[PDB]
Point group: D2
Chain length 95, copies 4
């Protein structure tokens, strides 16, 4: 295809960095998928098959955003869980 | 005679508050550390009723500092999740 | 004792209304305690034993605030739990 | 042939979004309802590839509306918990 999807690549890279920054690793299935698709997109970029490159980069961006909100949901439940245990200990002291 | 187990319970709550991220900058943790220092002053003086009550007050303020910091951390994580889902909707609504 | 703890009663009533407003009922142990101690505070008020009435009303206020944050913690965990199930269904659709 | 199971899955998603509090005022729910109406127009026309695709897009927008509303409801409850604990600390710090 054509032209080079350089702005899509930039968007995909941004989503990958956002997911890694919140704590997502290769152990998060969606981040492993995102990194694999982003690598395949670069392989299509070198081949100058830009329609294929754009479609793998779009898919990689989505999987990276799914990994990010997956990790943040677990992190939010864990903090709220620790707040709950804290508040049970406070009531036990005051009761 | 000495309220040794309460003193230990007060130390446990002080460590729990510091472990979730509370510092001397959290007003309730500074109060807890001051009331615990005063409890140790009373311990050395062998004024064990005064020591027990100050250790109890210090334990409460340490638990209040812990829940104060955990509420802010819970709001921040939920805030980051909200920004994340706004970016997801923007991507998926690119054609809308 | 003396004087009438009218401002304390007012703070106790305010805490009771705040706890009931977030969904706390007689089934939340701390709200049942708060309502019982408040009733006992009013019996002491009529008896003009204002030291006893203040101490009961203070205890009732605390238990009402503990019931309020107990219910709000459970409501916050339930909403975050529903958000988690929703995002699992979203990932299932997109995967 | 006819995407009958997809149409039911799209209806289920729309009912779930409305059940958590989303209305026509949720932009993603308004989109989902518009795309579902267009999917029914294609169903009656017996253009089942068009019907399936619009129904799948409507399902996605309904799931996006649902998690959008649940994020705001989670932030509001956590916000109410924060105000509640500020009042508790104020009461217990009356002597501080």
């Amino acid at each position: 295809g054509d032209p080079a999807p350089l702005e899509q690549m930039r968007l995909t890279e941004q989503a990958l960095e956002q997911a890694k920054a919140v704590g997502a690793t290769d152990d998060v299935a969606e981040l492993k998928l995102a990194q694999d698709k982003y690598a395949a997109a670069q392989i299509a970029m070198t081949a100058e098959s830009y329609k294929k490159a754009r479609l793998l980069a779009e898919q990689a961006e989505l999987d990276a955003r799914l990994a990010e909100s997956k990790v943040l949901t677990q992190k939010s439940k864990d903090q709220l869980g620790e707040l709950d245990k804290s508040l049970k200990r406070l009531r036990k002291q005051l009761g």
